[PDB]
Amino acid sequence: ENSLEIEELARFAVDEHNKKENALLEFVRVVKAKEQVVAGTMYYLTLEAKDGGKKKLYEAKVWVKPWENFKELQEFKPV
Amino acid sequence: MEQNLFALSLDDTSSVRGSLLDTKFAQTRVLLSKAMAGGDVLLDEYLYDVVNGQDFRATVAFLRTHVITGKIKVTATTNISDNSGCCLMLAINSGVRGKYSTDVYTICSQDSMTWNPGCKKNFSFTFNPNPCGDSWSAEMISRSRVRMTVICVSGWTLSPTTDVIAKLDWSIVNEKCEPTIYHLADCQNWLPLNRWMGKLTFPQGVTSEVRRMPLSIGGGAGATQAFLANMPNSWISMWRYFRGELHFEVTKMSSPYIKATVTFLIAFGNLSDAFGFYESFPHRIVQFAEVEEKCTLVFSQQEFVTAWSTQVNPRTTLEADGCPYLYAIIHDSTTGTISGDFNLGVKLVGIKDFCGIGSNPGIDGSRL
Amino acid sequence: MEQNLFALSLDDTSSVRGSLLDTKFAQTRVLLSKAMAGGDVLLDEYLYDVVNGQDFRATVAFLRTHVITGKIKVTATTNISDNSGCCLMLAINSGVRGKYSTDVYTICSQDSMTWNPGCKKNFSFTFNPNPCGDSWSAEMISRSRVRMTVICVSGWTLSPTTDVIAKLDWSIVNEKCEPTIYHLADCQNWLPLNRWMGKLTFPQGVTSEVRRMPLSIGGGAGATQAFLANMPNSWISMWRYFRGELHFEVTKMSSPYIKATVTFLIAFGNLSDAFGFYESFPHRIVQFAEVEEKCTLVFSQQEFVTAWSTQVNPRTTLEADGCPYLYAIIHDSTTGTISGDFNLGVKLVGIKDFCGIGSNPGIDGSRL
Amino acid sequence: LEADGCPYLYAIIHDSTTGTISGDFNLGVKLVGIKDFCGIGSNPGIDGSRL
Amino acid sequence: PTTDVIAKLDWSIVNEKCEPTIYHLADCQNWLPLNRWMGKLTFPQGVTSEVR
């Protein structure tokens, strides 16, 4: 798991969650990441984000098709 | 200070090498369900997708090294109480085609480990993902679509309390990658096959349990109005008749608690069940200890008079079928304190001093 | 097959080693602005934050290896047309305290490369991030807060068309990490300092340009109502008087197009500018070629009669100051087809055959 | 480029293209020859050029 | 340049042996010369990731 790729995907998760749900979570870092080869790659991320300036953990599921510029936030939730 | 950058050692085309720590490139997490059945895909992904989302010492070396002369070692550290046991089979195949069969028969050919967690604490095996050369790469196996498949061939004889996990540790050892190439020479010294002769269930009880597996192996194994095929089994059916020293590898699939003693012998189909004199024939007894799980029967050239046919017509009965069978007969009785069948897996590893005669037009069907 | 997992080579505590490809662990991208000034932080981050978001061959080995006996090589592949030039200085310091000074003076001590892209295509240098031992780790330098700082000591003499980038390549070579430890022995064979004697600007023209740098080096360099401090410069001021062979390292900071010839000599402060007989004193001439950028003046023990004081009172004038200076005098005139000053950087590398006398109560101030 | 399993020769700028005067950094690559050449098979042909 | 330029070519005859360069259909060859123009690579002035 290339940590640079995962950092970008974690930021994309927080940004997509903010777009989708009209929120303002502030990305802090990735804690955990699992890649699972599928039709493309599926990522299960555990990350820190600040809610109201309060650090919290979230789980995100991110689907990537590396042959297109396709990245999709499948789910995002507190742990 | 300055230096000439063109003449540095940045075009190092070494293979990946070092200790087992510094050659590890991925770990994989297989989930074994509390109640899993036989013929049950646990994991099935491309061998290159193993390495996605990984950060071990040789992960980046593995991806970026253009040529790798070493084999891939995979070790599986799964265990369970002696009370229970099952039979897992990890297996590597050079590719796929849509809606494929994942029956043990189909898979095992080529490169595979089979083990019973109940007996063996861990199990490792090396292999070459390019079967017709001395070398390979990460880019070769990503685009070639090399496919790793873990399958459960026999369920848990006694289920554990919770779900289980098998950790696979993919490394690169430093053995030479030797190729396994099949060819049409009539006499060959060692024709490997890894042909799944079949899973033998023997129920608990007192009855005369006899199981025949035919040595007319060619023309695949059965399905509905269909049949399955390995390459090596399709390859041996190129010839009409054949012979050789047959090297079976019989494996325990149940737990150590289900105990049984098994005679193996070559003989012809006409012999009925409830014929009580099987030990007139030359035979081999197979008792398993608690810890032993694997045993190799060999049947020399003196067990066969002539060559026999690779395929037989499907509609020939046991009464008129003049090719030899491999009998597996319960010497005493299947026993145990816990309920569960005595499963036992026979696998024709290969034929030594193989001699292939003629040229098979073909038959179309499987069993005899 | 099974194997005993406890006895495998998974507790391999080897250092990182191999070619320069397989020991590379990070690359860093520094942006040099089209119009950058002197005393201008280009990069300033913790040495462990270099390796964040990286995927080179030794990146994971670097982070996870508990002990590393090798040095860190860093090479910087930045270039520019001979027409122009500047002076970058990369520099590693064992830590920080809030709101710190990033003047070249402060930084250079300890471990640094200084180079002019105009002359040197690339520039590499090794160093030990733990200065008082043979070993270190990634976890040591993350928590110790080792700090890497790139600074531009002299701006572009002629600006490029666009912005520039300097690629740093952080590797681990296999040299022994030798410690640099300062101690209070009065006689020492080699007392390293890396004391920035000062940047010397000489304008283009015809006038008698003379620049004095005092060898009463102790008690730091100036600021507002303040002064700056290295450790080694604070260390030498422990003693009252001192002497030795002084090893300067004078460096070009302008482009090759601005040409000038510079005499260096030891002499006392009373000598005025427009005193035309500096070459009565023993001296050393320094012409630079297009490609040469670096030149080492040494001043033996015969240049100094007695030891001289490490610090002097700030209010002593040049007329009554009996410690020696290092003069830098333009032998001809500063010239060039393009406008820009002839910058030149002097750096006292170290004192050989150092002899430190007495015990300084201290003075409080800097320049003389 | 996504599904093309033959190798390429990459040429990547390690730092940045610079200079006091404007103009591109041109660079000409020329495959001189193949040593220890080994040619397999017999091309029916394709008809086109780039990949 | 400020003005037009000229290139003077000087054609001579040296005394080296004229060795022939003949292509042939052997599958394994020790040296197959090509002089194949792989391409001209332009990289503009600037800061961006230029890959060719």
Domain ranges for chain A, please list them. 1-79
Q: Which bin fits B84, alpha (ψ -120 to 50), beta or left (φ > 0)?
A: beta
Cα torsion at A62, A65, A66, A67 (round to 10°)? -170
The total of other beta-carbon atoms located within 10 Å of residue C307's CB is 17
Which residue in D14, D16, D17, D24 has the most chain C C-beta atoms within 10 A of its own C-beta, making it the best mutation to test that interface? D16
The total of other beta-carbon atoms located within 10 Å of residue B354's CB is 22
Q: From CA C198, how far away is CA C38, in angstroms rounded?
A: 13
Q: From the CA of C55, how many Å to the nearest CA of chain A?
A: 6
Q: From the CA of C47, how many Å to the nearest CA of chain E?
A: 24
What radius of gyration, in Å, describes the C-alpha atoms of chain A? 12
β-strand partners of A6 = none
> By C-alpha distance, which of B244, B71, B100 is closest to B172?
B71
Q: From CA B104, how far away is CA B91, in angstroms rounded?
A: 9
Residues of chain D with Cβ-Cβ distance to C79 below 8 Å are: 15, 18
How is residue C260 written in tokens?
A: 């000038």
Q: From the CA of E50, how many Å to the nearest CA of chain C?
A: 13
Q: From CA E52, how far away is CA D9, in angstroms rounded?
A: 8
Q: From CA B156, how far away is CA B161, in angstroms rounded?
A: 11
Three-class DSSP category at B169: strand
Which residue in D12, D32, D37, D50 has the most chain E C-beta atoms within 10 A of its own C-beta, making it the best mutation to test that interface? D37
Question: CB-CB: which of D27, D34, D38 is closest to E34?
Answer: D34
Any chain A CB within 8 A of the CB of C54? yes
Q: From the CA of A4, how many Å to the nearest CA of chain C?
A: 4
Put simply, the answer to whether C160 touches D18 (Cβ < 8 Å) is yes
The Cα-based distances of C82 to B96, B287, C37, C334 in angstroms read 59, 85, 19, 18
Three-class SS of chain C:
CCCCHHHCCCCCCCCCCCCCCCCCCEEEEEEECCCCCCCEEEEEEECCHHHCCCCCCCHHHHHHCCCECEEEEEEECCCCCCCCCCEEEEEEECCCCCCCCCCHHHHHCCEEEEECCCCCCCEEEEECCCCCCCCECHHHHHHCCCEEEEEEEECCCCCCCCCEEEEEEEEEEEEECCCCCCCCCCEEEEEEEEEEEEEEEECCECCCCEEEEECCCCCCEECCCCEECCHHHHHHCCCCEEEEEEEECEEECCCCCCECCEEEEEEECCCCCCCCCHHHCCCEEECCCCCCCEECCEECHHHCCCCEECCCCCCCCCCCCCCEEEEEEECCCEECCCCCCEEEEEEEEEEEEEEEECCCCCCCCCCC
- Which residue has 């399905």 as its token pair? B223
Q: From the CA of C269, how many Å to the nearest CA of chain B?
A: 35
Distance of CA B246 to the CA centre of its chain: 16
What is the phi/psi pair of residue B63, to 5°?
-65, -30
Q: From CA B112, how far away is CA C1, in angstroms rounded?
A: 11
How is residue C123 written in tokens?
A: 């520039």
Q: From CA C348, how far away is CA C153, in angstroms rounded?
A: 16
Put simply, the answer to whether E47 touches C165 (Cβ < 8 Å) is yes
Which residue in C28, C48, C51, C55 has the most chain A C-beta atoms within 10 A of its own C-beta, making it the best mutation to test that interface? C55
Three-class SS of chain D:
CCCCCCCCCCCECCCCECCCCCCCEEEEEEEEEEEEEECCCCCCCCCCCCC
Contact B265, B211 (CB under 8 A): no
Q: From CA A71, how far away is CA A8, in angstroms rounded?
A: 11
Nearest chain A alpha carbon to C52: A4
Nearest chain C alpha carbon to D24: C161
Burial of B89 per CB tally in 10 Å (0-12, 13-18, 19+): buried
Residue type, position B66, single letter = H
Q: From CA C284, how far away is CA C305, in angstroms rounded?
A: 19
Q: Which bin fits A34, alpha (ψ -120 to 50), beta or left (φ > 0)?
A: beta
Any chain D CB within 8 A of the CB of E51? yes
In chain A, % helix, strand, coil (3-state, to 5) comes to 25, 55, 20
Contact A65, A38 (CB under 8 A): no
Q: Which bin fits B214, alpha (ψ -120 to 50), beta or left (φ > 0)?
A: beta
Dihedral sign (CA C316, C317, C322, C327): positive
> By C-alpha distance, which of C91, C28, C88 is closest to C56?
C28
How is residue E7 written in tokens?
A: 């290139």
Any chain D CB within 8 A of the CB of C104? no
Burial of C143 per CB tally in 10 Å (0-12, 13-18, 19+): exposed
Q: From CA C326, how far away is CA C333, in angstroms rounded?
A: 19
How is residue C343 written in tokens?
A: 């910058």
The yes-or-no reply on E/C contact (3 CB pairs or more, < 8 Å) is yes
β-strand partners of B46 = B147
Resolution given for this structure, in angstroms: 3.4
Q: From CA A38, how far away is CA C43, in angstroms rounded?
A: 40
β-strand partners of B211 = B328
Contact D5, B143 (CB under 8 A): yes
Any chain D CB within 8 A of the CB of C222? no
- Which residue has 């022994």 as its token pair? C176
Q: From CA C149, how far away is CA C110, in angstroms rounded?
A: 12
User: What burial letters (b/e) apply to E7-35, b meaning 16+ CB within 10 Å?
Assistant: eeeeeeeeeeeeeeeeeeeeeebeebeee
Q: From CA C345, how far away is CA C89, in angstroms rounded?
A: 11
Q: How many helices (H) and strands (E) does chain B have?
A: 4, 21
Residues of chain A with Cβ-Cβ distance to B55 below 8 Å are: 1-3
- Which residue has 């950790």 as its token pair? B167
Contact C260, C332 (CB under 8 A): yes
Q: From CA B34, how far away is CA B51, in angstroms rounded?
A: 27
Residues of chain C with Cβ-Cβ distance to A2 below 8 Å are: 55
Residues of chain A with Cβ-Cβ distance to B52 below 8 Å are: 1, 35-37, 41
The total of other beta-carbon atoms located within 10 Å of residue B250's CB is 22
Three-class SS of B23-67:
CCCEEEEEEECCCCCCCEEEEEEECCHHHCCCCCCCHHHHHHCCC
The yes-or-no reply on E/A contact (3 CB pairs or more, < 8 Å) is no
**In this complex, which chains have at least 3 CB pairs below 8 Å with chain B?**
A, C
What is the phi/psi pair of residue B248, to 5°?
-80, 160
The total of other beta-carbon atoms located within 10 Å of residue B335's CB is 14
Q: From CA C135, how far away is CA C41, in angstroms rounded?
A: 29
Q: From CA C16, how far away is CA C2, in angstroms rounded?
A: 30
What radius of gyration, in Å, describes the C-alpha atoms of chain B? 23
Put simply, the answer to whether B3 touches C122 (Cβ < 8 Å) is yes
Contact C208, C322 (CB under 8 A): no
Q: From CA C248, how far away is CA C196, in angstroms rounded?
A: 10
Dihedral sign (CA B332, B337, B339, B342): negative
Put simply, the answer to whether C125 touches B64 (Cβ < 8 Å) is no
User: What burial letters (b/e) apply to C73-94, b meaning 16+ CB within 10 Å?
Assistant: bbbbbbbbbebbbbbbbbbbbb
Put simply, the answer to whether B3 touches C60 (Cβ < 8 Å) is no
Nearest chain B alpha carbon to C6: B122
Q: From the CA of C212, how many Å to the nearest CA of chain B?
A: 28
Nearest chain B alpha carbon to C75: B2
What is the phi/psi pair of residue D47, to 5°?
80, 90
Three-class DSSP category at A21: helix
> By C-alpha distance, which of C90, C98, C74 is closest to C24?
C74
Q: From CA B303, how far away is CA B321, in angstroms rounded?
A: 17
Contact A33, A45 (CB under 8 A): yes
Contact C325, C197 (CB under 8 A): no
Contact D26, E42 (CB under 8 A): yes
- DSSP label at residue B9: S
Contact C199, C211 (CB under 8 A): no
Instruction: Decide the pairing of beta strands C111-115 and C87-93.
Output: antiparallel
Q: Which residues contact C351 (CB under 8 A, 6 or more apart)?
A: C190, C191, C193, C236, C242, C244, C245, C246, C247
Cα torsion at B220, B226, B228, B234 (round to 10°)? 40
Contact B69, B176 (CB under 8 A): yes
* Long-range CB pairs of B181-185, under 8 A, 24+ apart, other chains included: B181/B131, B181/B132, B182/B231, B182/B232, B182/B235, B184/B238
Q: Which H or E run contains B235?
A: helix B231-236
User: What burial letters (b/e) apply to C115-141, b meaning 16+ CB within 10 Å?
Assistant: bbbbbbebbbbbbbbbbeeebbbbebb
Any chain E CB within 8 A of the CB of C161? yes
What is the phi/psi pair of residue C46, to 5°?
-65, 140
Q: From CA A8, how far away is CA C55, in angstroms rounded?
A: 14
> By C-alpha distance, which of C342, C308, C353 is closest to C326?
C308
Distance of CA C96 to the CA centre of its chain: 18
Contact C64, C51 (CB under 8 A): no
Contact B331, B263 (CB under 8 A): yes
Residues of chain D with Cβ-Cβ distance to C164 below 8 Å are: 15-16, 18
- Which residue has 């050079």 as its token pair? B94
Contact B252, B120 (CB under 8 A): no
Put simply, the answer to whether B52 touches A6 (Cβ < 8 Å) is no
Q: From CA C263, how far away is CA C255, in angstroms rounded?
A: 19
* Long-range CB pairs of C339-342, under 8 A, 24+ apart, other chains included: C339/C204, C340/C157, C340/C158, C340/C204, C340/C254, C340/C255, C340/C257, C340/C258, C341/C157, C341/C201, C341/C202, C341/C203, C341/C204, C341/C254, C341/C258, C342/C201, C342/C202, C342/C204, C342/C254, C342/C258, C342/C259, C342/C260
Q: From CA E39, how far away is CA B368, in angstroms rounded?
A: 65
Three-class DSSP category at B259: strand
Domain B1-368, second-level architecture: Sandwich (2.60)
The yes-or-no reply on B/E contact (3 CB pairs or more, < 8 Å) is no
Any chain C CB within 8 A of the CB of D49? no
Put simply, the answer to whether C20 touches B10 (Cβ < 8 Å) is yes
Contact C54, C26 (CB under 8 A): yes
Contact A13, A74 (CB under 8 A): no
- Give the angle subtended at the CA of C293 by the CAs of C287 and C297, to the nearest 5°: 60
Residues of chain C with Cβ-Cβ distance to E47 below 8 Å are: 31, 162-165
**In this complex, which chains have at least 3 CB pairs below 8 Å with chain A?**
B, C
Question: CB-CB: which of C2, C8, C55 is closest to B123?
Answer: C2
Instruction: Decide the pairing of beta strands B187-202 and B308-309.
Output: unpaired
Q: Which H or E run contains B106?
A: helix B104-108
Any chain D CB within 8 A of the CB of E43? yes
Q: From CA E37, how far away is CA E52, in angstroms rounded?
A: 15
Q: From CA B129, how far away is CA B142, in angstroms rounded?
A: 11
Distance of CA E47 to the CA centre of its chain: 30
Residues of chain D with Cβ-Cβ distance to C77 below 8 Å are: 14-15
Any chain E CB within 8 A of the CB of D6? no
Three-class DSSP category at B368: coil
Any chain D CB within 8 A of the CB of E1? no
The total of other beta-carbon atoms located within 10 Å of residue B223's CB is 12
What radius of gyration, in Å, describes the C-alpha atoms of chain E? 21
Cα torsion at C264, C270, C275, C278 (round to 10°)? -30
Contact B348, B193 (CB under 8 A): yes
Residues of chain C with Cβ-Cβ distance to D20 below 8 Å are: 80-81, 83-84, 158-161
Nearest chain C alpha carbon to D18: C80
The Cα-based distances of B285 to B265, B293, B297, B345, C65 in angstroms read 9, 14, 9, 15, 53
Nearest chain A alpha carbon to B53: A1
Any chain A CB within 8 A of the CB of B368? no
Q: From CA C323, how far away is CA C312, in angstroms rounded?
A: 8
Contact C324, C266 (CB under 8 A): yes
Put simply, the answer to whether C9 touches B3 (Cβ < 8 Å) is no
- DSSP label at residue A13: H
Q: Which residues contact B38 (CB under 8 A, 6 or more apart)?
A: B152, B153, B154, B155, B199
The CB-side HSE value for B67 (13 A sphere, CA atoms) comes to 10
Q: Which bin fits C62, alpha (ψ -120 to 50), beta or left (φ > 0)?
A: alpha
Q: From CA C89, how far away is CA C136, in angstroms rounded?
A: 24
Any chain A CB within 8 A of the CB of B302? no
How is residue A78 written in tokens?
A: 């507190």
Q: From the CA of C102, how many Å to the nearest CA of chain D?
A: 25
Three-class DSSP category at B140: helix
